[PDB]
Write a protein that binds this ligand. Structure first.
Ligand SMILES: *[C@@H]1O[C@H](CO)[C@@H](O[C@@H]2O[C@H](CO)[C@@H](O)[C@H](O)[C@H]2NC(C)=O)[C@H](O)[C@H]1NC(C)=O
Ligand SMILES: *[C@@H]1O[C@H](CO)[C@@H](O[C@@H]2O[C@H](CO)[C@@H](O)[C@H](O)[C@H]2NC(C)=O)[C@H](O)[C@H]1NC(C)=O
Ligand SMILES: *[C@@H]1O[C@H](CO)[C@@H](O)[C@H](O)[C@H]1NC(C)=O
Ligand SMILES: *[C@@H]1O[C@H](CO)[C@@H](O)[C@H](O)[C@H]1NC(C)=O
Ligand SMILES: *[C@@H]1O[C@H](CO)[C@@H](O)[C@H](O)[C@H]1NC(C)=O
Lengths: 210, 592, 211
């Protein structure tokens, strides 16, 4: 039982965006669905709901007249057609299922970013050891958020710390994803950091150590 | 396909059944008859009749219950007689009824089966639930083997695996004759029609009402359920349909869901529609789509006559043509057809689409307009009359107005309006907007009443009518509304900030505000047809909806929903412990 | 509408302690409250529906209570895993409303940081920019000061810090302060240092490098 959001990127203010939530592992056709948004780094806000059939749709006051909730029960997808997008709409948009009681199953959330700025892919630089040892990846100058940085295509997880990014002096974001390994394992293991900035379709695999 | 019907009257015809919806009757069956299909049969609603059969064994190893609702000779649930051949050595010698736990009603008859055995060893009273029923098991096979040591003098066949297990016991007067043991605590579940394995709803040998996947239940899972987030009834994601006495998630091979039960065919009030893979019977809300043959070329009938006319009742779309000739209107006495009753022409007040043409050369003298063809909106013109005509209205002496109130289109064909010397309003008509493509030359309007003579008496369209013209007199007989449209009638304004039935607008068409909105003054009462689009609730508000009363006893997924109204008439919820409902929010406010 | 006000906003407690979260609703709501758990960068997880009713396969330590206005969420024995922000949800009224959340974090033993310095990437310097990263792996409490010295000169107004959330396993923190310069100013100096002063350090630690 899972939900998958899609389409949440970057829009210019006044823009438009059709979010999409792919339902699987359950009878999507039988459950009333909802969108819930979360502006960084604040609380939860119900944004819209839809009838199982779809006959009845409800919008929260902030979003009314702008967003339009829909669903295609055949394509097993749900939609949020957001229009006349205000900066105040930048949030992570969760698509959630109303169970018998409560929102039992939720998707991963897609991040919409209302901004006049254009997209810039990150530069990936190696943070090399030593003087346990530590190594990283500098994911410098990028826009918008988010970037996902994995290690050894996921094979490495323990002692890893992907830091929260910081908006710089420039209109650009930057983060560092560091990993702490046992001192010995330096002339032993290969460490590759895999960075992905979806808005700029940037897919960088940077080798650290060898 | 678990449930199948059973024969009533008592080569070979077979049903690979599980539950037999009626009687299992095996009469005059060969010695070399393969009975593998009977291997899935567990329940028999009626009776089991095994008469005059040459097969050496009857194999029903899953047969657990025989309801005996229908009984053979008005006495038996199991009738086994003459299953032997007088000269042939081939005869019934064993009954594989190992799992036969009970017979709900009816008796047992097992006689004159010359080689059938082990029946005298069986305790029929441990099976036969009916206290006053008869058990006749004499005149069968002789010189048969004793019941194998592991079967303590009770067996269905000689084998160690085929013995009769005793399930019946003495019941305490707190069980009402339904128990798994003698102790007063050992009573059966309310939904067992008979005996027990244990106390739970699953442990039943037969269900009193329904079988929702192992558990005997009274009700098949409810189709709608109150949704707390949506504040209304919503399709239940746990819904099952009544296919026989079993609860089924999906309806079987070509079976349409209706109300809550799996049905063979759709009722007249509803229509077959696919939605989420399942075929359901949606209500029409009045008239359901019906298709009638029609007249003209290709068709049997020539004109709408007194006899054929009745075969157009409730018909919304005609799969052909319509011909109104003098022969059908005045009646043909050569083939003894009477004259057409004008009040019988009112069967076309339901017609919306004609696939082919509409030829009207005759019409009653007191009927001055084609008012019956009011609901007619579109004319296809797949089949055409004369030179290629879709609309033909000629030689109609007593027709004053066209009366086609809601006609919007005529897909293909040619117009013919001639010799209707009393007809007006047709002059103003914008045929370019009605007929698709070029109307150049393919428009025939001649020898009717001229505008000069129409205007002189006052025969002109309403001031509320558009440039496009009109169908006749009054605001209703318009083609397009200048301002707003009511129920087809052109109006100046909808009842927005005044008036008895309050309205709202959509594409210059007035629709009334939901009965539950409070009539607002100096502002709109609603902004949609919904019970949720109200400006204010005239009674109570259950979340987004204006309701007649607060939810009180409405079943939800987690049980009944009870709510009370606020000082501000809002449906606030009752306390969890209020099992009957409440006055207010406290526990002291619980109803009972 | 119904306002949901959670108390406290931040909560600190040791592993094993009985953690309590409150929730008061502006108007009457009966037992129509849901409780959510939101671990960093993840979607909320439904813990309690009803108001006391437990969701399938949610650890037994989680419990709910209350009716009408005041509510409680209780964690029998606080676990390292339990670190997250907790939310309220009224579903008795339209719109459905949530609380502001209660950030529950682990009060643990003092843990000194592992200081690490990282001199600029040659590829970065190729692009004409120099970033020196300072890493403070696994420490507690989250309060740590980091000074930047470039040729012993205090470099204030060119560095950015960033701290990870509490650890799911060891309940620690990690800080990343970065001094950024143009390849110019960078070559114009040699000794670059980190002056880390933490509660778990008697003396302030310095991790330096030379160009
Ligand atoms: C209720 O329905 C089920 C399904 O028809 C019946 O159980 C089946 O019957 C036999 C004996 O129990 C088994 O071989 C099958 O595995 C069962 N099927 C399923 C799907 O459970 C059950 O006997 C029915 N009747 C009652 C009174 O419970
Ligand atoms: C054609 O028209 C009407 C549709 O309403 C049907 O007549 C109804 O018959 C039902 C029972 O069959 C009665 O309950 C109603 O009182 C009748 N309605 C009216 C308005 O009189 C009629 O059966 C339809 N079908 C056919 C094939 O004639
Ligand atoms: C339609 O004709 C009927 C009688 O045939 C008459 O009662 C009615 O007034 C007419 N309506 C018009 C001309 O719109
Ligand atoms: C269709 O005809 C029925 C019966 O005369 C009437 O109730 C309905 O309003 C008509 N609909 C239209 C759109 O003309
Ligand atoms: C129309 O029939 C009427 C009676 O309905 C009759 O009085 C009249 O003469 C006929 N129409 C004519 C001749 O224009």
């Amino acid at each position: 039982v899972q939900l998958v959001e899609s389409g949440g990127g970057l829009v210019q203010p006044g823009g438009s965006l059709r979010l999409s939530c792919a339902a699987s592992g359950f009878t999507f056709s039988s459950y009333a669905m909802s969108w819930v948004r979360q502006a960084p780094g604040k609380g939860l806000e119900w944004v819209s709901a839809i009838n199982s059939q779809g006959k009845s749709t409800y919008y929260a006051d902030s979003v009314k007249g702008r967003f339009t909730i829909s669903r295609d029960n055949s394509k097993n997808t749900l939609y949020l057609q957001m229009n006349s997008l205000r900066a105040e709409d930048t949030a992570v948009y969760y698509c959630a299922r109303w169970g018998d009681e409560g929102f039992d199953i939720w998707g991963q959330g897609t991040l919409v970013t209302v901004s006049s700025a254009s997209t810039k892919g990150p530069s990936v630089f190696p943070l090399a050891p030593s003087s346990t040892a530590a190594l990283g990846c500098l994911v410098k100058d990028y826009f918008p958020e988010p970037v996902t940085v994995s290690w050894n295509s996921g094979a490495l997880t323990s002692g890893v710390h992907t830091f929260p990014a910081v908006l710089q002096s420039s209109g650009l974001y930057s983060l560092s994803s560091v990993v702490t390994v046992p001192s010995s394992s330096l002339g032993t293991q290969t460490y590759i950091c895999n960075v992905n900035h979806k808005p700029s379709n940037t897919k960088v695999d940077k080798k650290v150590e060898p | 396909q678990a449930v199948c019907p059973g024969t009533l009257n008592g080569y070979k015809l077979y049903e690979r059944c599980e539950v037999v919806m009626g009687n299992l009757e095996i009469v005059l069956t060969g010695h070399n008859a393969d009975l593998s299909f009977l291997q899935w049969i567990r329940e028999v609603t009626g009776y089991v009749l095994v008469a005059m059969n040459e097969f050496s064994t009857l194999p029903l190893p899953n047969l657990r219950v025989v309801r005996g609702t229908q009984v053979y000779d008005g006495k038996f649930a199991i009738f086994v007689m003459l299953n032997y051949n007088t000269n042939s050595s081939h005869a019934l010698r064993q009954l594989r009824l190992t799992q036969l736990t009970e017979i709900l009603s009816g008796g047992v008859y097992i006689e004159k089966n010359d080689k059938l055995c082990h029946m005298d060893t069986i305790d029929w009273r441990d099976i036969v639930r009916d206290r006053d029923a008869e058990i006749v098991v004499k005149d069968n096979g002789r010189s048969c083997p004793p019941c194998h040591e592991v079967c303590k003098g009770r067996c269905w066949g000689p084998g160690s695996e085929d013995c009769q297990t005793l399930t019946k016991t003495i019941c305490a007067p707190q069980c009402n004759g339904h128990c798994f043991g003698p102790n007063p605590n050992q009573c059966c579940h309310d939904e067992c029609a008979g005996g027990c394995s244990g106390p739970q709803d699953t442990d039943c040998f037969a269900c009193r009402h329904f079988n929702d996947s192992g558990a005997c239940v009274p009700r098949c899972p409810q189709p709608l359920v109150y949704n707390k987030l949506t504040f209304q009834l919503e399709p239940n994601p746990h819904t099952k349909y009544q296919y026989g006495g079993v609860c089924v998630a999906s309806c079987p091979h070509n079976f349409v869901v209706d109300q809550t039960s799996c049905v063979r065919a759709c009722p007249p009030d509803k229509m077959e529609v696919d939605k989420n893979g399942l075929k359901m019977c949606e209500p029409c809300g009045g008239l359901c789509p019906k298709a009638c043959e029609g007249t003209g070329s290709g068709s049997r009938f020539q004109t709408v006559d007194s006899s054929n006319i009745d075969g157009f009742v409730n018909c919304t779309k005609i799969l052909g043509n319509l011909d109104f000739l003098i022969t059908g209107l005045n009646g043909d006495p050569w083939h003894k057809i009477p004259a057409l009753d004008p009040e019988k022409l009112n069967v076309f007040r339901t017609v919306r689409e004609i696939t082919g043409y509409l030829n009207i050369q005759s019409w009653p003298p007191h009927m001055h307009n084609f008012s019956v063809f009011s609901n007619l909106t579109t004319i296809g013109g797949r089949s055409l009359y004369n030179r290629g005509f879709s609309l033909l209205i000629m030689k109609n002496l007593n027709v004053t107005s066209l009366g086609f109130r809601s006609l919007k289109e005529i897909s293909a064909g040619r117009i013919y309006i001639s010799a209707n010397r009393q007809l007006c309003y047709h002059h103003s008509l914008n045929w370019t907007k009605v007929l698709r493509g070029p109307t150049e030359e393919r428009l025939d309007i001649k020898h009717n009443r001229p505008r000069r003579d129409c205007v002189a008496e006052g025969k002109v369209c309403d001031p509320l009518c558009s440039s496009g013209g009109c169908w006749g007199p009054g605001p209703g007989q318009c083609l397009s509304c200048r301002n707003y449209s009511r129920g087809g009638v052109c109006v100046t304004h909808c009842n927005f900030l005044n008036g008895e039935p309050r309205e709202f607008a959509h594409e210059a068409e007035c629709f009334s505000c939901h009965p539950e909105c409070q009539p607002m003054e100096g502002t709109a009462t609603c902004n949609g047809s919904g019970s949720d689009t109200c400006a204010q609730c005239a009674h109570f508000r259950d979340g987004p909806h204006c309701v007649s009363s607060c939810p009180h006893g409405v079943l939800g997924a987690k049980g009944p929903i009870y709510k009370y109204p606020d000082v501000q008439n809002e449906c606030r919820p009752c306390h969890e412990n209020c099992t009957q409902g409440c006055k207010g929010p406290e526990l002291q406010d619980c109803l009972g | 509408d119904i306002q949901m006000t959670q108390s406290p906003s931040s909560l600190s407690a040791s592993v094993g302690d009985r953690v309590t979260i409150t929730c008061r609703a502006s108007q009457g709501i009966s037992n129509w409250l849901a409780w959510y758990q939101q671990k960093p960068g993840k979607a909320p997880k439904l813990l309690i529906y009803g108001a006391s009713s437990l969701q399938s396969g949610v650890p037994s330590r989680f419990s709910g209570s209350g009716s009408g206005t005041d509510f409680t969420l209780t964690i029998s024995s606080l676990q390292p895993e339990d670190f997250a922000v907790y939310y309220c949800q009224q579903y008795s009224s339209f719109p459905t409303t949530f609380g502001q959340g209660t950030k529950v974090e682990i009060k643990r033993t003092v843990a000194a940081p592992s200081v690490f310095i990282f001199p600029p990437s040659d590829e970065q310097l190729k692009s004409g920019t120099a970033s020196v990263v300072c890493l403070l792996n696994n420490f507690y409490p989250r309060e740590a000061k980091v000074q930047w010295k470039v040729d012993n000169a205090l470099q204030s107004g060119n560095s950015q810090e960033s701290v990870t959330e509490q650890d799911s396993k060891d309940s620690t923190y990690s800080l990343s302060s970065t001094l950024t310069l143009s390849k110019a100013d960078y070559e114009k100096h040699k000794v670059y240092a980190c002056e880390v002063t933490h509660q778990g350090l008697s003396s302030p630690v310095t991790k330096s490098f030379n160009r």
